[PDB]
Amino acid sequence: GALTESQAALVKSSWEEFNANIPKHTHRFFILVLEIAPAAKDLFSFLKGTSEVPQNNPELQAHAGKVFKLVYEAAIQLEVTGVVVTDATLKNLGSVHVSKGVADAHFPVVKEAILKTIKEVVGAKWSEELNSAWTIAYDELAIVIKKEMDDAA
Ligand code: HEM
């Protein structure tokens, strides 16, 4: 696809839409995760011991917000510059995932959970050209974190 000026404009616009409702989009995102894969629950400190996904847990919200921010920032950086840049933060991210027991086959779980989350977020504006734009940005960012986990292990 690339990342035409016209595609990037379409990711920005759809991220602004996501941030606009963190407690919803973030608890949604954790349920689409547990639907695709239920066992994933024991991994998360704030989900252990619970029977259901807490809806107002600040620990969970702050956690899932930081996740989507990082995908969007990736798309713009691809249209301007042509790439996704690896920094300290992406590296520390790779360590914590490993401590907690996370693996690569967990990633399509979270991608489908994010495309389905953004198709749910943009509704009728959805275009091929947009799906094509977030797919390219997640795929490009996951490539980068998987790379750093492997390195934290
Ligand atoms: C591009 C994709 C991904 C991004 C951008 C991302 C980002 C993050 C961030 C930023 C943190 C730490 C947040 C904090 O300090 O508050 C974190 C923690 C964690 N991540 Fe991910 N993540 C990704 C994929 C995954 C996958 C595929 C899994 C597996 C299900 C996973 C499981 C976890 C767990 C268990 C923790 C620790 C939570 C704790 O017990 O408190 N992540 N992630």
From Swiss-Prot:
The modification Nitrated tyrosine is found at residue 138. This is Leghemoglobin-2. It comes from the Eukaryota. The modification Phosphoserine is found at residue 45. Gene3D superfamilies: Globins. It comes from Lupinus luteus. Belongs to the plant globin family. O2 binds at residue 63. Heme b binds at residues 45, 66, 97, 100.
